[PDB]
Amino acid sequence: GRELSFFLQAGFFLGMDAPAGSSVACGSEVLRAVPVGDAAKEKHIPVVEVHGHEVKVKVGSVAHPMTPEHYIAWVCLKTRKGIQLKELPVDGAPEVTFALTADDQVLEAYEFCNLHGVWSGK
């Protein structure tokens, strides 16, 4: 399934095919895989829009807040050939674009909100 997990402290860890119940000891936090997240769906599920070899991800079917207290931190893209992750500038829009090689195709997008956690969309 090439299953993605996320462990968040201040930085974070991305796991690929982490076994169930895996954890990261980092300081004395023990970090566990965060869950993926109805009423929060509108502002948090990533919308994926492909054109050619570019994939725009928008957080918001309508736009999520991008303020210092409440923001989208990053978006991760899983594709057939690999993974990508880009952090979002806190004072920009809740969107980011990734580029793919011609042989690659998108599978799933994931976004982290600093207050509401991780959400996935296709």
Instruction: Please state the length of the chain.
Output: 122
Nearest distance in Å: CB 84, a second copy: 5
Phi, psi of 44 (to 5 degrees): -125, -25
Within positions 94 to 113, which residues make up the interface with Fe ion, using CB under 5 A?
A: 113
When the beta carbons of 50 and 90 are compared against Mg ion, the nearer one is: 50
51 is an interface residue for Mg ion by CB under 5 A: no
What is the binding site for a second copy (CB under 8 A)? Answer: 2, 7, 10-28, 53-54, 81-87, 97-101, 104
Q: Tell whether 44 is in a known binding site.
A: yes
**What is the footprint of Mg ion within residues 86-115 (CB under 5 A)?**
102
Q: Are residues 110 and 36 in contact, defined by beta-carbon separation less than 8 angstroms? A: yes
Q: Is 64 annotated as a binding residue?
A: yes
Contact (CB, 8 A) for 7 and 31: yes
Q: In what order do the strands lie in the sheet with 46-51?
A: 46-51, 54-59, 95-99
Sign of CA dihedral 89, 92, 95, 98: negative
SS3 42: helix
**53 in a known ligand binding site:** no
Determine if residue 102 is labeled as part of a ligand binding site: yes
> Which of a second copy, Fe ion, Mg ion, none interacts with 57 (beta carbon under 5 to 8 A by kind)?
none
The residues that touch Fe ion, with contacts defined as CB under 5 A, are 50, 113, 115-116
